[PDB]
Amino acid sequence: EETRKIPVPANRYTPLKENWMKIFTPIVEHLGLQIRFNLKSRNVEIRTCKETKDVSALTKAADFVKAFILGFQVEDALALIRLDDLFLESFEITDVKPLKGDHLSRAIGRIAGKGGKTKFTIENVTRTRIVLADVKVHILGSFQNIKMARTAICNLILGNPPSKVYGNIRAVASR
């Protein structure tokens, strides 16, 4: 029997409560694993049973709930379940340029854009998903889509205006 454990932070506990149903129903029904929430250590516990085939889904199942730990929505984690080549790439905003204080918050605002729209646009361009943590940035998609969204984000935090990045990312999407 193979076992997976994934830690949950404190701020991810309440969303884990309100989205638990749509977390275990994709696992036990059409994927067939054993789920529980280890409440003492605050871990997510994955085990095999006698009803397991296609063992790789096991690993996929782990990444499933790991996406929900990182801040992603439930349906995007289902997209990790359904598809076979869908990856996570993560980097800090300061890992590409040293920004301190208000400049770092302004870089966050340039990634997000007013109303979120800029960030929103990049998903409709790149068929990825993006989580903006406190300093971290997480990208969910295929490898070329990850590369394209990562380049768009890095240019957004170089100092390039979000309008220019909007136009050029609409242009580069057509290849």
């Binding site: 349906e75 995007d76 289902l78 997209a79 068929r127 998609g141």
Partner: peptide, 25 residues
């Protein structure tokens, strides 16, 4: 949903188009 977006971007739309072209006594 990301899976739905990728599947719809990789498939072809079909269906809706209504083309209007063209005894007892």
């Amino acid at each position: 949903p990301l899976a739905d977006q990728i599947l719809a971007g990789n498939a072809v739309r079909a269906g809706v188009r209504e083309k209007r072209r063209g005894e007892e006594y």
